[PDB]
């Protein structure tokens, strides 16, 4: 269990993020929470997790577009919350366009959330977890971070570089009781997702299932969605003391994407 | 938890192995414990691990240089214990010398156990999971499954060699309730590597433990020895139903070893 | 221009190992041929090759399924052509069928020839190569080296298993003049390939473009075949001295399969 | 040979931008120099290469941390050599620091250069290669793209960004006549490594070659420099037919860093 340990979740309001949150959350862990999306909403989420689990629970509504912004989610986590030893690096945006007709304003903020701020998230975060003597840095890249797709360039390149970070995050705390990895999912069937079906069954004429299944069939063999829960199972085990020598690598969560 | 579940531990009486099948016992798995030893020890391992967790322990002798004798085991567990759920191919041996100084005796036995056991013990237990609908295939590769060092060749060749029998382990039973992967350990203090810390005290002329801490230095950036106990959960974790989409995969469990 | 070198092909009476070898002559290398087939027709190819780029070309139909046979192979091109530069291994095997009906002989066949050949041939190799301070390891991977496919368990194992091999080559030869590296292809036309297809045809009920084109689709995203010829210069380019620091790594030659 | 075609490197008035420029040049190629320095030595450069080859030769000084002055330098390539055949993004910066200490002025500046120039480069040359129907896109990466060293993060997330972006080009023009792939050295003695060197050789209290060969051993088993020239020939191969199916890929000329 996690019980007495804080974890900043970043994009926790829905999605991947609320199931990684909700997980560790079961696990005992206080948890910030941070992301955007409906006020009357999110603070149902915030509550409702506090209540259910006997944990705290704090929301944060930092733009992690902006490095400060980052920097002042984890710094504001230690004040509220006394600690922080588990990160999890989620926030991301997807846009999908050939290379030449990618929008620079796209590409800069695909790079800024999904790639610059796990830099700024980590940074504030390190001098707390070395000073604790125990830190978790769980980065949620993609398959995306180890192979690529045609189209998202922006998007493959910025989870190629979190992955790269993720491995000089452990090399340089290495042995210091803290780890660093990086989750690499396949599909899972959120809004980010939802709307590339919706675009592959416009383009196609099917209806949206059939846009759905093909989309799987693509990259995914296994021919089922990865879900929030077990993404949030696997985040519980990289925190769990199992993991204590698991630095610096990629935990593919695919379906077998990445072995053909 | 895996009440009701039955796993195959191949090498389980002694080193990972052993670490494995106690973790699996531990979340109630009926086990089969595998690999070669004195009567007594074994059997009070055996009796041992039944007692304390609850569960049955069988022990099955068989030398699994031989390709029958793997599929025997696999059969035996299924005649004994009703059915196979998780099959740990664990079981491996180690050589070190220069390519044209290696034994072409000591290349055939490493591929025959570190490579061909795999297939084998595969080959038996995959009807049985395709028809339960369940299973897992948990293969000990290593950190040599990925990269190399010198003098190893036998031994990196079969380990990349059960690193891609696992991806089409998983891709030909994608979807069917089945998942392979393959734990690729870093410096685990067993008999296997103390043999090797021994050679380099003496061929260094320092004591064991200035030995130990350079063998581990030149590898494995945590200066931390990887425990059977943490691989132990790593295998606990690949069984649970959070990792039912964590397939044909590699979990490097190497203190950083691969980062760099 | 490998003017004054020896390169020895195995597998070179036919396909990509004779595109290797005639690229090889072509820059004035000393070839000893290998494989089967009517000897009138390797005469042919062996004089014609001779003749035409003014180079010594032996021939050899060692069966390299056998240890003893592969070092013959070496040692005799030794004894005969007063040297060894480079290495290319090529000779390979292929068969398809699920993991659980995959046949032992087959498994041994395809690990005997497409693994242990490579062990063997470098085993004998590396001695002369040595004392010489130059060499050239040329191993002839595939994609499957370092992805997979269902179906392909023995080839897929083998061929990681080289990958593998050739890095343990590389670190053991470090800074003697001597490198070793794997090229990895993708889809080249030869009955190797021309076997698959011809069964997809008759699987899909289609004619032998159509199952082609397919084939080609599924893996390939340049929709083009690669060539012996691209082979060839892939082999040229690493035996020159360009490529003197290009040691323990894959060439992919694959169309992008492997990007995705 | 490479006559009638157009060739642009970045950050080529040095180190081993100026050994591929000079290597594609020898091959009749017409080029396109950009980089900062000494504007005397530039012109010489410039001069030299022009009238030892027989090519023209055109100085672009665009500083390539702006977006818009990297899609200039290739349109203007266009517009004054009549077209572009291969872009080589070669420019890049270094700095060295923990994450916590990294400046996110330093950060910002080597995503903008050693990650974003590819993007911006490739965006403008695509258009142009996709027209033509031929094209050669060559990134300089680094074995940074592969794997960590502590104290990197920036450059180690900008080199794996570029081995994903590369990745994702090569899959947008399959099949087009274009082909993108991504060189990844090992340690190069330029300016860039020397001033590391020079740390190395303060921090330890060694001389400069002490230093250099400790540099060295930490990294690449060879223990020999990697060459600009060495560089030139492999951007070469990639421009040559032979490497017409290499696409998506990265070309490691490390030494072994990698392997091990
Ligand atoms: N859905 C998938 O198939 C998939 C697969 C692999 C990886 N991923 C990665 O998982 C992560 C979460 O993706 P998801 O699919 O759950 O997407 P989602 O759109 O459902 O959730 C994104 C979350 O990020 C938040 N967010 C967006 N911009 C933000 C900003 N500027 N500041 C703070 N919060 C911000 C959103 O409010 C939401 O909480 C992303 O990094 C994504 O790239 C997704
Ligand atoms: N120790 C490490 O640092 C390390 C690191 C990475 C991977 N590995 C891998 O982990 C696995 C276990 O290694 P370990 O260090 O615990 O070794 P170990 O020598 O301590 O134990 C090996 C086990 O396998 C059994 N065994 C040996 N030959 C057998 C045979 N022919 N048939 C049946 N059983 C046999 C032994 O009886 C023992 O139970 C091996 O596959 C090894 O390659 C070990
Ligand atoms: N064809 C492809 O799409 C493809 C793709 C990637 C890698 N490869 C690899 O390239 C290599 C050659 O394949 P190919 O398509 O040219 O096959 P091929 O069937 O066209 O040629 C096989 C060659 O090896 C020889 N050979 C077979 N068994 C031998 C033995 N026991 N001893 C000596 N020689 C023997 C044959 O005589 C022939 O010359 C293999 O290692 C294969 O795995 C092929
Ligand atoms: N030296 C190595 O060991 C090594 C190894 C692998 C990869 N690399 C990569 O090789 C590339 C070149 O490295 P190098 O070692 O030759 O370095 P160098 O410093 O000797 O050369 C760098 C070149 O880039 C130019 N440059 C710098 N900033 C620029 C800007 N804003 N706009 C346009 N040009 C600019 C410089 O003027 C120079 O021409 C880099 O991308 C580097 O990361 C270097
Ligand atoms: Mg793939
Ligand atoms: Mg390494």
């Known amino acids: ?83 922080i030893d588990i990160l999890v690096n989620n926030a991301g945006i997807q846009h999908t366009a050939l290379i030449e007709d990618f929008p620079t304003e796209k590409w800069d903020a695909i790079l800024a959330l999904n790639l610059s701020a796990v830099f700024h998230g980590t940074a504030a975060a ?39 970070f993720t491995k000089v995050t452990a090399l340089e705390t290495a042995g210091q009781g803290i780890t ?19 675009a592959l069954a416009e383009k196609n004429g099917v209806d949206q299932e059939t846009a759905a299944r093909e989309l799987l069939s693509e990259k995914q063999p296994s021919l089922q969605f990865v879900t929030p829960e077990q993404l949030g199972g696997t985040a519980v085990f990289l925190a769990s003391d199992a993991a204590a020598q698991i630095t610096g690598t990629t935990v593919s969560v695919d379906g077998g994407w990445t072995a053909r």
Chains 1, 2, 3, 4 share one sequence.
């Open 1 to 83: 269990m996690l019980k007495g340990k804080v974890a900043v979740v970043t994009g926790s309001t829905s999605g991947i993020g609320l199931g990684i949150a909700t997980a560790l959350a079961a696990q005992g862990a206080d948890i910030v929470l941070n992301g955007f999306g409906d006020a009357a909403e999110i603070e149902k989420v915030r509550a409702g997790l506090a209540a259910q689990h006997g944990v705290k629970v704090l929301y944060d509504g930092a733009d992690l577009s902006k490095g400060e912004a980052v920097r002042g989610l984890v710094d504001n986590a230690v004040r509220q919350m006394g600690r």
């Open 126 to 164: 390190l001098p707390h977890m070395k000073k604790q003597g125990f830190g978790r840095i769980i980065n949620i890249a993609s398959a995306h971070g180890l192979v690529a797709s045609a189209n998202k360039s922006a998007y493959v390149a910025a989870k190629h570089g979190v992955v790269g």
């Open 180 to 198: 660093a990895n990086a989750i690499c999912p396949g599909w899972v069937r959120t809004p980010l997702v939802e709307k590339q079906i919706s």
